[PDB]
């Protein structure tokens, strides 16, 4: 009884965002892969540090809340203000949408980039069950499983 | 203020080296001192306390907008260096992957 990411995500995985869950003579093991999870975290961070950046343009008063201005000039100010409100509100909702899609698709990319690495490692010694696991056709003790994780499997 | 008279205040900017000439024979409120500008400031209108303990850079009538987030849904008239006012109250940026729960078997 063990499964991969083609199905569901593991909730027991807490050292990182991706990991190996193996099964052999000595039993189950769940250990995160550090390189892949940092590569995902460091790109979401790259987004934050680009959008959190501040604007250094200072705007002053042109309206007057206490003492109203000419109806014409005020109406035109209101017209411009509400028009700018519409642009930023649009540019905002879209940016969140795009970056949320690029974020979601970013993490999926790094899961496969790890799955397709372990695949080339095992060469002709294992098969794809189809659910994100590898049926290994040779006895693999707890030491051999860790050789797959730290990229030493021969 | 009990007086049905009215005083109309006018103003002009006298260029350096220029002269303003007043010719009158009554009904003239006269200037005693001319005013000169000092430096840079920022005019805000408000209705809340001043607080020298907290440091801020964005002002609306209800106080100070202190934030790193690029948007704000507080006041469309805030002055200073401010986040952009947007119609929406909340826009959630994903900082994590798609959450797919787990099932036992």
């Amino acid at each position, epitope marked *: 009884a063990i499964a991969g990411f083609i199905e569901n995500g593991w909730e027991g995985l807490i050292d990182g965002w991706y990991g190996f869950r193996h099964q052999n003579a000595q039993g189950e093991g769940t250990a995160a892969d550090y390189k892949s999870t940092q590569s995902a975290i460091d790109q979401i961070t790259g987004k934050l540090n680009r959008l*959190i950046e501040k604007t250094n343009q200072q705007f002053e008063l042109i309206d007057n809340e206490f003492n109203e201005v000419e109806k014409q000039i005020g109406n035109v100010i209101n017209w411009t203000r509400d028009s700018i409100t519409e642009v930023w509100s649009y540019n905002a909702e879209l940016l969140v949408a795009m970056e949320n899609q690029h974020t979601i698709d970013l993490a999926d990319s790094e899961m496969d980039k790890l799955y397709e690495r372990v695949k080339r490692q095992l060469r002709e010694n294992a098969e794809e069950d189809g659910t994100g696991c590898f049926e290994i056709f040779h006895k693999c003790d707890d030491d051999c499983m860790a050789s797959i994780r730290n990229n030493t499997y021969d | 203020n009990g007086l049905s008279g009215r005083i109309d205040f006018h103003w002009l900017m006298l260029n350096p080296n220029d002269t303003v000439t007043f010719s009158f024979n009554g009904a003239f409120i006269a200037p005693d001192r001319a005013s000169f500008l000092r430096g840079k400031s920022m005019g805000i209108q408000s209705g809340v306390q001043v607080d020298a303990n907290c440091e801020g850079d964005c002002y609306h009538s209800g106080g100070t907008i202190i934030s790193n987030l690029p948007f704000q849904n507080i006041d469309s008239r805030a002055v200073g260096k401010c986040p952009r006012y947007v119609k929406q109250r909340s826009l959630l940026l994903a900082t994590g992957m798609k959450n797919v729960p787990e099932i036992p078997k």
Partner: antibody
Amino acid sequence: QVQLQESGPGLVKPSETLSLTCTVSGASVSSYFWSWIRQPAGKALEWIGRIYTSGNTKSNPSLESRVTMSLDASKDQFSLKLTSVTAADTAVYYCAAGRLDYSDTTGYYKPPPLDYWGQGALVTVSS
Amino acid sequence: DVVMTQSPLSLPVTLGQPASISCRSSQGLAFLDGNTYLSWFQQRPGQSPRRLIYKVSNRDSGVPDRFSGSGSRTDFTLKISRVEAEDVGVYYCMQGTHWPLTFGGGTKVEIKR
């Protein structure tokens, strides 16, 4: 109620294995991030690496080829080994600890906080 | 590597006067958890450095009132409200968001008495 005490040779020969060890007083090693920060004679602080129980010796690239960290949970001592030592590795070697929240999944992928420090050990590298 | 640059590099102040220290990072220091991890460290004569400010603004417990941290995402400032004779020493800033931990050059504060 926690204290970190460095210990080890005061001088190590050029190309030896500089070894040091931070002994923990009044706390469990299992519950912290463990950093080694070295300060050469009158220079900026240099952060060597950090480890935590269950292993993850994340280290600075300048020294990663030569750094080796491990920590014993029964003797309560962070340890450190810098192989092939140079005159550049002559420095004060403070060890440091940082809070470790098990559930903060995103905390293992961020440099650890530097909550507590030791007195610092001088390792002069000469012959 | 994130580059921590402090200024000034020697800050002689007058016993009981205020002063500030600017630390500019080569990169933004935000993290996924919403906190920007900049810290300020004070290393006094012949001692281990101790942490004054963590997370840009939060002051650590057991530290004089006059230490208040501030900053944005690239530009940060340590403010001392009233430097007394006991604040002599070297002051560092460290980013704590990006591998590896990096420290500022350090500012030498010497009291003018």
